[PDB]
Design an enzyme around this catalytic site. Structure first.
Site, short mmCIF file in Angstrom:
data_model
loop_
_atom_site.label_atom_id
_atom_site.label_comp_id
_atom_site.label_asym_id
_atom_site.label_seq_id
_atom_site.Cartn_x
_atom_site.Cartn_y
_atom_site.Cartn_z
CB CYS B 65 28.87 46.70 11.26
SG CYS B 65 29.33 46.12 12.91
NE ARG B 68 26.83 43.50 9.27
CZ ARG B 68 26.44 43.24 8.03
NH1 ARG B 68 25.13 43.11 7.77
NH2 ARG B 68 27.33 43.12 7.05
CD1 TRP B 237 34.99 44.40 20.42
CD2 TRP B 237 33.26 44.07 21.83
NE1 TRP B 237 34.36 43.23 20.05
CE2 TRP B 237 33.30 43.02 20.89
CE3 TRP B 237 32.27 44.08 22.81
CZ2 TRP B 237 32.37 41.97 20.90
CZ3 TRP B 237 31.35 43.04 22.83
CH2 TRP B 237 31.40 42.01 21.88
CD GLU B 242 36.87 50.16 14.68
OE1 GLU B 242 36.09 51.11 14.43
OE2 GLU B 242 36.63 49.27 15.51
C1 HEM Z 1 30.66 44.85 19.28
C2 HEM Z 1 31.77 45.34 18.72
C3 HEM Z 1 31.79 45.98 17.39
C4 HEM Z 1 32.84 45.94 16.52
C5 HEM Z 1 34.15 45.26 16.81
C6 HEM Z 1 32.47 46.66 15.35
C7 HEM Z 1 33.35 46.86 14.28
C8 HEM Z 1 33.12 47.83 13.31
C9 HEM Z 1 34.08 48.28 12.37
C10 HEM Z 1 35.52 47.83 12.31
C11 HEM Z 1 33.49 49.20 11.55
C12 HEM Z 1 34.13 49.96 10.39
C13 HEM Z 1 35.06 51.09 10.86
C14 HEM Z 1 35.98 51.59 9.77
O1 HEM Z 1 35.74 51.36 8.56
O2 HEM Z 1 37.00 52.26 10.05
C15 HEM Z 1 32.14 49.30 11.98
C16 HEM Z 1 31.23 50.12 11.34
C17 HEM Z 1 29.94 50.21 11.83
N1 HEM Z 1 29.41 49.56 12.90
FE1 HEM Z 1 30.16 48.20 14.01
N2 HEM Z 1 31.24 47.16 15.48
C18 HEM Z 1 30.73 46.76 16.68
C19 HEM Z 1 29.48 47.07 17.24
C20 HEM Z 1 28.51 47.85 16.63
C21 HEM Z 1 27.26 48.20 17.18
C22 HEM Z 1 26.82 47.82 18.58
C23 HEM Z 1 26.55 48.92 16.21
C24 HEM Z 1 25.20 49.52 16.30
C25 HEM Z 1 24.22 49.12 17.13
C26 HEM Z 1 27.41 49.01 15.07
C27 HEM Z 1 27.11 49.63 13.88
C28 HEM Z 1 28.11 49.98 12.96
C29 HEM Z 1 27.82 50.97 11.92
C30 HEM Z 1 26.51 51.69 11.70
C31 HEM Z 1 28.95 51.12 11.21
C32 HEM Z 1 29.15 52.05 10.02
C33 HEM Z 1 29.51 53.47 10.49
C34 HEM Z 1 29.72 54.46 9.35
O3 HEM Z 1 29.10 54.36 8.26
O4 HEM Z 1 30.51 55.41 9.52
N3 HEM Z 1 28.57 48.32 15.35
N4 HEM Z 1 31.91 48.42 13.03
C1 LIG Z 2 36.54 52.05 3.62
N1 LIG Z 2 36.46 52.23 5.08
C2 LIG Z 2 36.17 53.45 5.54
C3 LIG Z 2 35.97 54.51 4.65
C4 LIG Z 2 35.67 55.76 5.19
C5 LIG Z 2 35.46 56.84 4.32
C6 LIG Z 2 35.59 55.94 6.57
C7 LIG Z 2 35.80 54.85 7.41
C8 LIG Z 2 35.74 54.96 8.82
C9 LIG Z 2 34.44 55.60 9.39
C10 LIG Z 2 34.52 55.60 10.79
C11 LIG Z 2 35.45 56.45 11.38
C12 LIG Z 2 35.59 56.49 12.76
C13 LIG Z 2 36.55 57.35 13.36
N2 LIG Z 2 37.29 58.02 13.83
C14 LIG Z 2 34.79 55.66 13.55
C15 LIG Z 2 33.84 54.80 13.00
C16 LIG Z 2 33.12 54.03 13.96
C17 LIG Z 2 33.26 52.51 13.73
C18 LIG Z 2 32.69 51.75 14.79
C19 LIG Z 2 31.38 51.86 15.30
C20 LIG Z 2 31.00 51.04 16.37
C21 LIG Z 2 29.70 51.09 16.93
C22 LIG Z 2 31.91 50.13 16.92
C23 LIG Z 2 33.19 50.07 16.38
N3 LIG Z 2 34.11 49.22 16.88
N4 LIG Z 2 33.53 50.87 15.36
C24 LIG Z 2 33.71 54.76 11.60
N5 LIG Z 2 36.09 53.66 6.86
#
Ligand code: HEM
Ligand SMILES: CNc1cc(C)cc(CCc2cc(C#N)cc(CCc3cc(C)cc(N)n3)c2)n1
Ligand code: HEM
Ligand SMILES: CNc1cc(C)cc(CCc2cc(C#N)cc(CCc3cc(C)cc(N)n3)c2)n1
Ligand SMILES: [Cl-]
Ligand SMILES: [Cl-]
Lengths: 362, 362
Positions: B65, B68, B237, B242
């Site tokens: 993430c 953070r 948000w 994304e």
């Molecule tokens: C506040 C705004 C937030 C933004 C802009 C943000 C942004 C992102 C982004 C861009 C990713 C990766 C998505 C991708 O690879 O396509 C991500 C992954 C993640 N975010 Fe955040 N995030 C936010 C808030 C949060 C919150 C509030 C939590 C949990 C309390 C969180 C937990 C995670 C987790 C667990 C992942 C990994 C999900 C996975 O493995 O599929 N995020 N975040």
């Molecule tokens: C290398 N990067 C990589 C690689 C793989 C295999 C998958 C993903 C994306 C995972 C994923 C997919 C979808 C959707 N739809 C939403 C998420 C939630 C991401 C997320 C979570 C939160 C809480 C806030 C925020 N702004 N964004 C993760 N990324």
């Protein structure tokens, strides 16, 4: 244990190499010869066939390289015979000429005598055979900052650059037995450069950007069957993003994105305008256009990724494990538009291969 | 060894949590209470303070993430008291409303009763609380392909989608003791959507694209001190990429790049034109513009990376090790324009954290 690691590496390489060449029957006797030769001399000499195939295998095993589809067509030049600095200079000039090939770039490696007991015979100081100098005197930066330390080393040795943004560094190398390296100015007739223009935006020429045609990496060690070829410069053709997204765009390189934004007519004031992204796309379009117009080989990152997909397929068909470094294989623009982004790669090191070595200056 | 791994995780969490809260003196007695409670009941119950801080720590430890920096302002809603499906439904509706906050998105997590002996009390089937359905009947694809299997599961259960490209999936979850999940249609007054338009290109509206305001991930397990909260949906948000570089651009998602290329007036015929890259930039500019115009929270990848740099700095100042997954932290467009690209990260798993779990359908 010096000799033992040599013999072990030799055994593995000779078996694999001869297997691939359909020469598996000859493995036994060749190994015998090698073991005796190590027993007596402390090392062994590759046949021309072994050296050529070894250099090709080394490219094939280069985890960080997206261009590996063409590994088997590497042009290998055996210069294990050189003994003088004039012979080294002439070999490096020849590499530039034959690799450049009037713009139809030939992937080429020139291989110099290997280390003997860790003792280098020839030690090349250049990072690439063709590269621009870099300077900084009280605030103002000129040329390529990545070349600052080598440029200073050259100037210590009596070279002097014109202090344009694109001075060609001299070839600089040291022979076994000499305390100081020698340097030689590059003949400009040998060096192709491409002025950067844009297909639609006439003002792009105002930036007065250019780049050299051929990237010839000259500071890595080729390791084949336990033999260490520390001096073995190699080249391909550029992928456009190396020039447009790295060399000309990085803040610690030519740092041109604000200037690009200005000439393409967009503000560089707000992150949310994605002006850096937009400038990157137009600069990268310009790079590809300019090389293509001049007839200098280049590949775009989409085509390169497609070729790499075929490399993966070929590896599986041949029954060879595929290795790769995802972090280097994805292109620095639109990486998720390539198949590379959406799979994983085993980053294991397999030999023969190319390796980093310590810089002899700094 | 069930109880032993619980006690060990509890010891580590309680010490760390109370240290951060300035409550280190109370660690000894709290641990005593916990050990007795495990002895008798086989588990223990978090205080409200422990639960809140645990969920914040879990976000702070989420290697993938980029967002953070704001970990300590997470809004934690304790719903460990729910026992009925109407109470679950109402809690999920409430999460959507309070997280959305009329567009000024509040990062929020709602925490439901945890697993008892691996036995879930509530099992949420949705990947996100708000997401679009996907269909395929003989060749033709409609909506979001990533939702195809869940959509089919819902329709098995008596739900029927209108088969627009943007049908809202119902909330679907199962209670302990029930053989089948229940589903509830989302009230549309609860769901903010943003139509995608471009700041300069009027024809962009012809694509009739839109996206929902708030990503609320609802299929991950929150683990705190050895307690497994399998049902604990959370949101932030969006970062614009994304939506613009993944959801709307991926070939296996909405696959809109050729259509974008057409409306922005460029050919989609030659790799060397970098039309995919150009289309990606304009689509991503459109996404940011559209959310900003409507007053719905969003961040661009440059600003996000800058915030993450401050998160790194804050971690070092607090004396906490930083962990991260470089492959997920770099944005999918212009990654080398961010500082993230140019350093490395330790991808070690630290708890509390959020984890994947098996889908209850498929
Ligand atoms: C506040 C705004 C937030 C933004 C802009 C943000 C942004 C992102 C982004 C861009 C990713 C990766 C998505 C991708 O690879 O396509 C991500 C992954 C993640 N975010 Fe955040 N995030 C936010 C808030 C949060 C919150 C509030 C939590 C949990 C309390 C969180 C937990 C995670 C987790 C667990 C992942 C990994 C999900 C996975 O493995 O599929 N995020 N975040
Ligand atoms: C290398 N990067 C990589 C690689 C793989 C295999 C998958 C993903 C994306 C995972 C994923 C997919 C979808 C959707 N739809 C939403 C998420 C939630 C991401 C997320 C979570 C939160 C809480 C806030 C925020 N702004 N964004 C993760 N990324
Ligand atoms: C034929 C055209 C070629 C193309 C388009 C190509 C492309 C590339 C690219 C894009 C990189 C990564 C650069 C970066 O991350 O900024 C790279 C790395 C590399 N390539 Fe290739 N390459 C080609 C030929 C070759 C040849 C002929 C060899 C050796 C015989 C080679 C060996 C390597 C090695 C060793 C690296 C890693 C260098 C390092 O660690 O710094 N490549 N290549
Ligand atoms: C994550 N990617 C990443 C990470 C780091 C730390 C460095 C690099 C770039 C290394 C590097 C820099 C420069 C230059 N100038 C040339 C190279 C030569 C690349 C190269 C070599 C060859 C033979 C052909 C070709 N087309 N390109 C590599 N990439
Ligand atoms: Cl380069
Ligand atoms: Cl999403």
């Amino acid at each position: 244990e010096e000799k033992e690691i040599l013999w072990n590496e030799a055994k593995a390489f000779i078996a694999a190499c001869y297997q691939e060449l359909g020469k598996a029957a000859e493995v036994k006797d060749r190994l015998a010869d090698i073991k005796s030769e190590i027993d007596l001399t402390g090392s062994y000499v590759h046949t021309k066939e072994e050296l050529e195939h070894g250099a090709k295998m080394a490219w094939r095993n280069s985890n960080r390289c997206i261009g590996r589809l063409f590994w088997n067509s590497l042009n290998v030049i055996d210069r294990r015979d050189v003994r003088t600095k004039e012979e080294v200079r002439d070999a490096l000039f020849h590499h530039i000429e034959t690799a450049t090939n009037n713009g139809k770039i030939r992937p080429t490696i020139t291989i110099f005598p290997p280390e003997e007991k860790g003792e280098k015979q020839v030690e090349i100081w250049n990072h690439q055979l063709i590269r621009y100098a870099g300077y900084e005197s009280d605030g103002e930066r000129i040329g390529d900052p990545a070349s600052c330390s080598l440029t200073a080393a050259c100037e210590e040795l009596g070279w002097r650059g014109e202090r344009t943004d694109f001075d060609l560094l001299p070839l600089i190398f040291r022979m076994k037995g000499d305390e100081q390296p020698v340097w030689y100015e590059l003949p400009r007739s040998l060096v192709i450069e491409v002025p950067i223009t844009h297909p639609d935006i006439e003002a792009f020429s105002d930036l007065e950007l250019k780049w050299y045609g051929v990237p010839i990496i000259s500071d890595m060690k080729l390791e084949v069957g336990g033999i260490h070829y520390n001096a073995a410069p190699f080249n391909g053709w550029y992928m456009g993003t190396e020039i447009g997204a790295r060399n000309l765009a990085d803040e610690k390189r030519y740092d041109k994105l604000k200037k690009v934004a200005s000439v393409i007519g967009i503000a560089a004031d707000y992150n949310t305008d994605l002006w850096k992204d937009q400038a990157l796309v137009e600069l990268n379009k310009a790079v590809l256009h300019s090389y293509k117009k001049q007839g200098v080989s280049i590949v775009d990152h989409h085509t390169a990724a497609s070729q790499f997909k075929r490399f993966e397929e070929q590896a599986e068909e041949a029954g060879r494990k595929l290795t790769g470094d995802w972090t280097w294989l994805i292109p620095p623009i639109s990486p998720a538009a390539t198949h590379i982004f959406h799979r994983s790669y085993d980053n294991s090191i397999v030999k023969p291969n190319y390796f980093y070595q310590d810089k002899p200056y700094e």
